[PDB]
Amino acid sequence: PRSLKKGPFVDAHLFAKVEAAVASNSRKPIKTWSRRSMILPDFVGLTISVHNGRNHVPVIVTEHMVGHKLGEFAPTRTYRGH
Amino acid sequence: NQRIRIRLKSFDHRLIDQSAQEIVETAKRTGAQVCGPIPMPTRIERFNVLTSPHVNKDARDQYEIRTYKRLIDIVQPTDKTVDALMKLDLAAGVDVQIAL
Amino acid sequence: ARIAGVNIPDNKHAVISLTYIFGIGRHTAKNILAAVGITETTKIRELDDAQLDAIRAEVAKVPTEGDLRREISMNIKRLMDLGCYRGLRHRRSLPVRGQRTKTNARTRKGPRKPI
Amino acid sequence: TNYGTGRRKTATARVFLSAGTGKLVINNRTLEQYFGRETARMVVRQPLELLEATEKYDLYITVKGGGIGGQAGAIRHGITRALIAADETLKPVLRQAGFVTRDAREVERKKLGLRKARKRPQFSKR
Amino acid sequence: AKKGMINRELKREKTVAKYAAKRAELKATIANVNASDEERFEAMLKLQALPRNASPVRLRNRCGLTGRPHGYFRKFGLSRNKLRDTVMQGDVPGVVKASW
Amino acid sequence: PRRRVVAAREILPDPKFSSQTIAKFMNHVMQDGKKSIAESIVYGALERVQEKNKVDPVEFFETTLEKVRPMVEVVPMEVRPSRRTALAMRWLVDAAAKRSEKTMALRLAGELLDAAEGKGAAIKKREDVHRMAEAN
RNA sequence: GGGAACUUUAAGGAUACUGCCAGUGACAAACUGGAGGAAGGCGGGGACGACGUCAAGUCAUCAUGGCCCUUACGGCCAGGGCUACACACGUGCUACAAUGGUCGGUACAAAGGGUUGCUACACAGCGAUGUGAUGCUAAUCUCAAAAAGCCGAUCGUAGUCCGGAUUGGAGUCUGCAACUCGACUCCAUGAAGUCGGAAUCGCUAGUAAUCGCGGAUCAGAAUGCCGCGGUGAAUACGUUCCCG
């Protein structure tokens, strides 16, 4: 994982959108391609449409998600059996 | 105690020997004493190159390139010695470094 | 002798005997023995009661059997409920740390299943 | 007084032989300190044992390169050459013993397409 | 290789050259311990705000004649296909067939 | 080799007793080049035997080897003198392995001491080989 | 301080030719043995591939005849994939232990890499590593600890003080960024496996077997590939059988 001396990594545009919504109290989902951004405590209570390669999947952020990356909740491969 | 140190580098040991002989003769003419030439260890670099355009991993060419080094010491310089060394011509393929 | 609820062998050295408790390895065993004051080569059979309760007090300070198994189970169950990538791998019983599955996944998969 | 040089598998030994009463020193160490396995010590002592002269010489030995076996062989070769350089007439006996020959076997190079000098990767028709 | 890939490599090289000094200064500020933690965080943000092609990890070595991206040999700057042909006809100084 | 005859390789006698039998036995014992371990095992076995009975190791060993030496291999084919010693030392090596003493040197010493009296696993190995030898 | 002896470094030379002796062969070629010699009958290894074969491989290194596309089969970007997983095969690595595991002490290499690099030493940390600082453009300083080996203690045949897969938790570093999908460190966990069916592979000597070390590619990422040394065997009567 990323070294603690550097702190969590969040994309600037995603952080700007999140802080704008939280300064406001808007409710429509935030659309993003930033699968690599870490989920911060400010994200809790928001719905984010994360790209998964061909679509945007909605993710409702809860408390326990803090400390994960956004991409962990949008799987990319489709498998149902042989 | 003014000592001149000359280091010769080359990719060809015959060329480097020719240059060293020329330098030592030029110095002995002016009459300063010489030490050397001393041969330093040679460096060898090897390369493995695939010869087929697409797929034959066992068909390869092995090449190499060597770097020869010679060391020359000049003691008790004569005034003419440094000028003769500087007027000595630069042979292609041999690199000469002079330190005082 | 009974320590932490299991019977460790009595004819072995203490550092090897204490590793028979779930949640204790060689490093933890030698740490406990050094902290209490018993030599690492002393067998359990030649340990008096007082040192036995001394060891028990130290073992009380680390999660050993039921607490540790419960904690591990809770950690796995939380991932499975959350539904992240690792939770999906745990649900499908597949490698979790990025190993290949086209071949060589038999520890997670179990023995081969004929078509 | 007399000198000898020995070589065996990239090992080199310098041997100085003089007249005295049997002291032996290798790299400022005794034989038992320098060599741990006893067969190496027997290999070192073979030339003087074969001559019944182990208490009539001093040996001063330096050795460099190789392993334990190579160094023992080099020391034996150097002792043989030093003895020959002291008495010429001794050479037939040492040559009969086989100590005069310089062993020329050396590690073979790895070759392209092989795992080792000779070992070849596993082959399959199908 | 296609002409587009070569022009892409050229464009990335130009961007790396253009943003060289600012990135080094930012990294020095980051690794500076005397500056305030606010300053270090601001430098981290500025470094993350640069264009992606400014970073040198996105450069790939290509053959100087054909642009091939595999088998590079940094010493010569040529991929294996051109290296073999240039060596075997004598235009590379010091390189010979190796045997030992 | 379809044209040639290759001379048998000649090995040096051991440094301690100057016995090629002991040297060849040591080479049979050795695995993957650990001659130091092989020497330790063989010399320990001979030393233990000498402590048990004050007999010189070289003829002690060759006498026991002659006793275990078979005249016929395993279905009887006929063999050459070198093969005799080959399979004799081969069987001798195995019996000490399945013996039960703590150190291999002691195990080999026990095997030799018991084979010297005919009560050795190598001995019944030879007996079974012979029993199938009278078959044909 | 000094010496130019020895080792080494690396250029140039000498040496081996059945040359000498004893029999054979055919009255030859050749073959057998001995001396001297570092080496004796081609001393060991490498590069060098005849006339030709397979419409063998490569239009994706490159060049090129012909055919096809042209607001698209050309060009720019972000995210994903090449890493999937009921299965089958090829090539490897690590094991199943006592000729061994662990702990303490103590020896002996070769070759190769280093200035956007390698780092002595001190301090901090269990450790990956971090901070300060010194030398090196290198037979000068450094990577660097060789490992197997030897001496001593312990373990006493147990799925074990064997083995080290998988999983939980906590970290370091490279990088704009380690979710898919990096390497490494620590604590915990401790799977299969007790030598492998029919069958099948490599190797004739410093070889096989076994032990460690380096490099190209490369920000990071080798159990692969190309190299280096340490220890160091067994067996060949012969040409019926299998293959070319």
Helix axes F57-68, F35-52, angle to 10 degrees: 100
Task: Estimate to the nearest angstrom the gap between the alpha carbon of C60 and the chain centroid.
Answer: 15
Q: Chain E residues with CB inside 8 Å of B95's CB? A: none
Who among B50, B51, B65 is closest to E95 (CB)? Answer: B65
The letter for the amino acid at D32 is: E
* Other beta carbons less than 10 A from residue A68's beta carbon: 16
- CB of B51 within 8 Å of a chain D CB? The answer is no
**How far apart, in whole angstroms, are the C-alpha atoms of residue C49 and residue C38?**
13
DSSP characters for D28-67?
TB-HHHH--SHHHHHHHHHHHHHHT-TTSEEEEEEEESS-
Taking the CA atoms of chain C, what radius of gyration do you get in angstroms? 20
Q: B37: cis peptide before it, omega within 30°?
A: yes
Longest Cα–Cα distance in chain D: 72
Chains D and A touch (3+ CB pairs under 8 A): no
**Residue A63 contacts residue A44 (beta carbons within 8 Å):** yes
Q: Chain E residues with CB inside 8 Å of B51's CB? A: 84
Chain A (33-62) residues lying within 8 Å, Cβ to Cβ, of chain C: none
**How far apart, in whole angstroms, are the C-alpha atoms of residue B24 and residue B85?**
10
Q: Chain B residues with CB inside 8 Å of E68's CB? A: none
Cα separations (Å) of A9 from A3, B12, D86?
Answer: 10, 55, 81
Resolution attained, angstroms: 2.4
Residue E97 in domain: no
**What is the residue range of B12's domain?**
2-100
Residue B85's nearest CA partner among B40, B34, B38 is: B34
Q: Chain D residues with CB inside 8 Å of B48's CB? A: 112
**Residue B50 contacts residue B56 (beta carbons within 8 Å):** yes
**Residue E81 contacts residue E73 (beta carbons within 8 Å):** no
> Which of the nucleotides lies closest to C75 (Cα–C1')?
G168
Q: Is B34 exposed, middle or buried (0-12, 13-18, 19+ CB in 10 A)?
A: middle
Number of domains in chain E: 1
Q: Is strand G in 7 Å reach of the CB of E4?
A: yes
**How far apart, in whole angstroms, are the C-alpha atoms of residue C62 and residue C64?**
6
Number of domains in chain A: 1
**How far apart, in whole angstroms, are the C-alpha atoms of residue F109 and residue B38?**
62
C78, two tokens: 């939380």
Length of chain C: 115
**Residue E45 contacts residue A12 (beta carbons within 8 Å):** yes
Strand partners, B60: B50
CB–CB of E96 and B64 under 8 A? yes
Cα separations (Å) of A47 from A20, A25, A30, A58?
Answer: 14, 12, 7, 6
Which residues, in sequence order, are CB contacts of F6 under 8 Å at separation 6+? none
* Nearest-neighbour CA in chain D from B57: distance (Å): 8
Secondary structure class of E92 (helix, strand, coil)? coil
Which residues, in sequence order, are CB contacts of B92 under 8 Å at separation 6+? none
**Residue C17 contacts residue C33 (beta carbons within 8 Å):** no
DSSP characters for D74-110?
HHHHHHHHHHHTT-GGGHHHHHHHT-SS-----PPPP
Tell the residue number behind the tokens 């299943």, with chain if given. Answer: C113
Burial C53-86 (b: 16+ CB within 10 A, else e): ebbeebbeeeebeeeeeeeeeeeeeebeebebbb
**What residue ranges do the domains of chain D occupy?**
1-126
Phi, psi of F124 (to 5 degrees): -65, -25
* Nearest-neighbour CA in chain E from B10: distance (Å): 9
Chains C and D touch (3+ CB pairs under 8 A): no
Chain B nearest-CA residue for D112? B58
Q: Which 23-52 residues of chain D approach strand G with CB closer than 7 Å?
A: 27, 34, 36-37
F66, two tokens: 């002659």
**Residue D23 contacts residue D89 (beta carbons within 8 Å):** no
Kind of pairing between the strands at E96-97 and A56-60:
unpaired
Alpha carbons within 13 angstroms on the beta-carbon side of residue D60 total 8
Residue E49 in domain: yes
Q: Which 27-46 residues of chain A approach strand G with CB closer than 7 Å?
A: 33-36, 38
Nucleotides, chain G, CB distance < 7 Å: 6-12, 36-39, 43-47, 57-59, 61-62, 74-92, 98-100, 107-113, 131-132, 138-139, 146-151, 154-157, 161, 165-169, 171-183, 186-191, 200-210, 216-219, 225-239
